[PDB]
RNA sequence: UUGACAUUGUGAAGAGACAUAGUUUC
RNA sequence: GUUCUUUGUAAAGUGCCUUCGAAGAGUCGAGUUGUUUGGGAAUGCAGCUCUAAGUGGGUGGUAAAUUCCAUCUAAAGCUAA
RNA sequence: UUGACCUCAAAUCAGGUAGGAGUACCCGCUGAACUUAAGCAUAUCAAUAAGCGGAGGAAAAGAAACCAACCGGGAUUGCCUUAGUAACGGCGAGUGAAGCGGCAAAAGCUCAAAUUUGAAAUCUGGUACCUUCGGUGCCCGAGUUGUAAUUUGGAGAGGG
């Protein structure tokens, strides 16, 4: 609010904190992103390398959705089972009856391997896996089942 | 198009009203606030559902 | 019926029978007034597929409009501004010559309602059109569940507003990716995408 | 088809017990019909060929089908219509001034 | 006009934008209005519900196709199978969509079932005038909720047949990738004089 | 201002080709 | 809600068999000029020149030839929230 | 000589209709420059202001020559979002939309192209009466160069 504001505090001084010499004027270095390759270049390189020019291929009419594919790491993975049920599967880790986790149903497109699941067997249903995710999942006695 | 209304997190809203309810017990607060409860039977003051 | 015959025949405008016909008729029209009453459709099969009917309260007008670019008016070609705007002479006009056709007979018969219109001919100076019109206060029309919509006031001077088939064409009214700009109608969708929408509880 | 049941590759996609719908008649908006065949047949012989069509069947008889196509492509929209137009012109030739 | 270490911003306020500022001050009013509209329509609409039986349908594209969702209307085949014509269906509070097609039996049956349930749980008063007043259930959506179909069971045996998922993917990717090139080799080696 | 295309049709003589029957073009 | 006329040798809905199944042209489309668009070998609009088909036609956001596939059904029209 | 037809006219002919105003919002046309780029022409301001024609209580749009590329959706409009993104751009300054998803609201349709051909089955007007937003009888007239019923692609039509 205005009450807490330096302009209340500048009342009575001449230059409003803007200086007597340099003044406060309209648009000294130009407006907006003006000057980029000229009098504002030092700031642009440093702070914004990369800014001018092009890289890579244009893609006309790109539809994000095409590329929708959220990742989940083994890291979690057991999170996709509600906890009441989790402990029941954690202990009695087995074939014959291992949990089915539908990672697409949870809204994930790829399973990745960040790290360490307990030795319990999981049946993991997913669209994609990372070679490691599968290796690890298997060393616990589970499988990946590829869905769509 | 000045901002007139203010977003407050729902949960913080609740924290506040919870605190406020808690304080309607606690006679000295009720006293401090104006409110002439210097001789009510007790606090919280609860009354028959017949009301 | 004969209308299917007339339809196919009419697609052979390079054919001997038709260029004889085109040539004689197009001289006759040019002799008549630039806007004149037509006695009867000269493509009866065309008129009737655009909504015409041989009952009273349906009218055909024939009209003539100059061909070629819109020469930008302006004294002596002077534009008084930036170079991008110095054109005068390859400038094309966003409505069709048929819109002009309609709008002019429409003003000539203000008691009428332009229903639709079709091309009949052209030489190097003019395009010729017949415009089919409906009398919204003729009882024959006012009854008639099929045509009395045209009686509502929302349909005054459709030709002046881009609501005949030619106008919706030029206005770019069509579904799809090719018509994003112009479709809910272009001034309106511009306005849409350039409105700052602020909520009480700022989003 | 049949889809493979996985998420990349040739017939990618979920398997589903499948059905195939009764045909829509729109979908047959192209088709002939005895009526149109007859009327178009009749009008053709009423009003006969047109100038570019006349240069076309010469070109064919006198210069081959490839140079007819090139010219017809320029005349008409484009190449697929040129194929059709020559084909048609070829059949005017056959049917008529032959057998 | 460029200083400090700040992100580069893109505030499009270079047109006469202050002429196109819509502040929704009428958020409360509209809500009220919209509520009154519904109360009114409900009343006019006698005992009918405010809405039409909408069909189940599987959503488009790789992203949402996991989910199932209300569609526009039922399809001539669905309606037919549930034993009614569409003209009548339309008058009995059911939505009908000539545009949609059945390629998918699970969805087809789901929908036909929906129509059976709907018909059993409504009553259609006689044409005359008699009107045996029956109390309006406002929704139909709420009465006949679309649910997501169960696609498996919570636990089950582990079948590891041996061949890794990752490599099945890579290969499947691969086959596709070289499909045309191998066809050119098939063609070109077939033209072995 | 200059060219091409369209407005643009009808004859006759002369040139021009499938390569010394006339469709076609100047 | 009531009440009076029965409109009718009227109108409509549905199942099987058979033969049919008409569906918009100086338009679609094309070249070029100009304008416009986020629209890029060209997003729409218009002028001039060319100008279609019917197992066709349009679209499928990189021009082209070939082969397929998917999806609608233009050049006419009404319509509350 | 007489009587049609076609096309074109005239009436203070019978009855009607348009104009002008308003114009916040709406449908079109036409169309700037200041300005920004630290100069400036492309660009920007802006498909904005000014000028012109045309509507309503909303207008417009609307039952796909759509979106998609999925297990596919399904008229139009608007909101949230997609997104300051794909893309455009002296690739500078700057600009910049769409498909999906959630929600408000929901509604669907009619012509043309068809031999009623055992019967133009259709309609304006005048006129008399009546129970007058109209009906019936009668008479001029329109209309076969096609007015009704039937059919609209989702179909649908003729036979059995
Ligand atoms: Mg502040
Ligand atoms: Mg203050
Ligand atoms: Mg202070
Ligand atoms: Mg101080
Ligand atoms: Mg001090
Ligand atoms: Mg002080
Ligand atoms: Mg000081
Ligand atoms: Mg300071
Ligand atoms: Mg000072
Ligand atoms: Mg840049
Ligand atoms: Mg993680
Ligand atoms: Mg008349
Ligand atoms: Mg100027
Ligand atoms: Mg320019
Ligand atoms: Mg109205
Ligand atoms: Mg745009
Ligand atoms: Mg804020
Ligand atoms: Mg803005
Ligand atoms: Mg500015
Ligand atoms: Mg307001
Ligand atoms: Mg609703
Ligand atoms: Mg009743
Ligand atoms: Mg010359
Ligand atoms: Mg002339
Ligand atoms: Mg059509
Ligand atoms: Mg312009
Ligand atoms: Mg262009
Ligand atoms: Mg191609
Ligand atoms: Mg109509
Ligand atoms: Mg409309
Ligand atoms: Mg008079
Ligand atoms: Mg006026
Ligand atoms: Mg301008
Ligand atoms: Mg300014
Ligand atoms: Mg400057
Ligand atoms: Mg300056
Ligand atoms: Mg200057
Ligand atoms: Mg511009
Ligand atoms: Mg203005
Ligand atoms: Mg009014
Ligand atoms: Mg309203
Ligand atoms: Mg309207
Ligand atoms: Mg349709
Ligand atoms: Mg589809
Ligand atoms: Mg839609
Ligand atoms: Mg540069
Ligand atoms: Mg920038
Ligand atoms: Mg712009
Ligand atoms: Mg929705
Ligand atoms: Mg309706």
From Swiss-Prot, chain A:
Residues 1-38 are annotated as: Disordered. Keywords: Cytoplasm, Isopeptide bond, Ribonucleoprotein, Ribosomal protein, Ubl conjugation. Belongs to the universal ribosomal protein uL15 family. InterPro entries: Ribosomal_uL15, Ribosomal_uL15/eL18, Ribosomal_uL15/eL18_sf, Ribosomal_uL15_CS. GO terms for cellular component: cytoplasm; cytosol; cytosolic large ribosomal subunit; nucleus. HAMAP family: Ribosomal_uL15 (MF_01341). A motif (Nuclear localization signal) lies at residues 6-12, 23-29. It comes from the Eukaryota. It comes from Saccharomyces cerevisiae (strain ATCC 204508 / S288c). PANTHER family: 60S RIBOSOMAL PROTEIN L27A, LARGE RIBOSOMAL SUBUNIT PROTEIN UL15. Residues 1-13, 20-29 have a biased composition (Basic residues). Component of the ribosome, a large ribonucleoprotein complex responsible for the synthesis of proteins in the cell. The small ribosomal subunit (SSU) binds messenger RNAs (mRNAs) and translates the encoded message by selecting cognate aminoacyl-transfer RNA (tRNA) molecules. The large subunit (LSU) contains the ribosomal catalytic site termed the peptidyl transferase center (PTC), which catalyzes the formation of peptide bonds, thereby polymerizing the amino acids delivered by tRNAs into a polypeptide chain. GO terms for molecular function: RNA binding; structural constituent of ribosome. The lineage of its organism: Eukaryota, Fungi, Dikarya, Ascomycota, Saccharomycotina. This is Large ribosomal subunit protein uL15. There is a cross-link at residue 95 (Glycyl lysine isopeptide (Lys-Gly) (interchain with G-Cter in ubiquitin)).
Swiss-Prot record, chain B:
It is found in: Cytoplasm; Nucleus. It comes from the Eukaryota. N-terminally acetylated by acetyltransferase NatA. Component of the ribosome, a large ribonucleoprotein complex responsible for the synthesis of proteins in the cell. The small ribosomal subunit (SSU) binds messenger RNAs (mRNAs) and translates the encoded message by selecting cognate aminoacyl-transfer RNA (tRNA) molecules. The large subunit (LSU) contains the ribosomal catalytic site termed the peptidyl transferase center (PTC), which catalyzes the formation of peptide bonds, thereby polymerizing the amino acids delivered by tRNAs into a polypeptide chain. The eukaryote-specific C-terminal extension harbors a nuclear import signal and delivers the ACL4-uL4/RPL4 complex to the pre-ribosome, triggering uL4 release from ACL4 and incorporation into the 60S ribosomal subunit. This is Large ribosomal subunit protein uL4A. The lineage of its organism: Eukaryota, Fungi, Dikarya, Ascomycota, Saccharomycotina. The gene is RPL4A. The chain holds residues 106 to 156 of 362 of the full protein.
UniProtKB/Swiss-Prot annotation, chain C:
Pfam families: Ribosomal_L15e. It is found in: Cytoplasm. Its main location: cytoplasm. GO terms for molecular function: RNA binding; structural constituent of ribosome. One of its GO terms (biological process) is cytoplasmic translation. Gene3D superfamilies: Ribosomal protein l15e (3.40.1120.10). Residues 163-184 are annotated as: Disordered. GO terms for cellular component: cytosol; cytosolic large ribosomal subunit. It comes from the Eukaryota. Residues 168-184 have a biased composition (Basic residues). InterPro entries: Rbsml_eL15_core_dom_sf, Ribosomal_eL15, Ribosomal_eL15_CS, Ribosomal_uL23/eL15/eS24_sf. SMART domains: Ribosomal_L15e. Keywords: Cytoplasm, Ribonucleoprotein, Ribosomal protein. There are 2 genes for eL15 in yeast. Component of the ribosome, a large ribonucleoprotein complex responsible for the synthesis of proteins in the cell. The small ribosomal subunit (SSU) binds messenger RNAs (mRNAs) and translates the encoded message by selecting cognate aminoacyl-transfer RNA (tRNA) molecules. The large subunit (LSU) contains the ribosomal catalytic site termed the peptidyl transferase center (PTC), which catalyzes the formation of peptide bonds, thereby polymerizing the amino acids delivered by tRNAs into a polypeptide chain. Belongs to the eukaryotic ribosomal protein eL15 family. NCBIfam families: PRK04243.1. This is Large ribosomal subunit protein eL15A.
Swiss-Prot record, chain D:
The lineage of its organism: Eukaryota, Fungi, Dikarya, Ascomycota, Saccharomycotina. GO terms for biological process: cytoplasmic translation. Gene3D superfamilies: 60S ribosomal protein L36. Component of the ribosome, a large ribonucleoprotein complex responsible for the synthesis of proteins in the cell. The small ribosomal subunit (SSU) binds messenger RNAs (mRNAs) and translates the encoded message by selecting cognate aminoacyl-transfer RNA (tRNA) molecules. The large subunit (LSU) contains the ribosomal catalytic site termed the peptidyl transferase center (PTC), which catalyzes the formation of peptide bonds, thereby polymerizing the amino acids delivered by tRNAs into a polypeptide chain. This is Large ribosomal subunit protein eL36A. It is found in: Cytoplasm. Belongs to the eukaryotic ribosomal protein eL36 family. GO terms for cellular component: cytosol; cytosolic large ribosomal subunit. Pfam families: Ribosomal_L36e. InterPro entries: Ribosomal_eL36 (IPR000509), Ribosomal_eL36_sf (IPR038097). The keyword Ribonucleoprotein applies. Present with 31600 molecules/cell in log phase SD medium. PROSITE patterns: RIBOSOMAL_L36E. Its main location: cytoplasm. The modification N-acetylthreonine is found at residue 1. One of its GO terms (molecular function) is structural constituent of ribosome. Keywords: Acetylation, Cytoplasm, Ribonucleoprotein, Ribosomal protein. The keyword Protease does not apply.
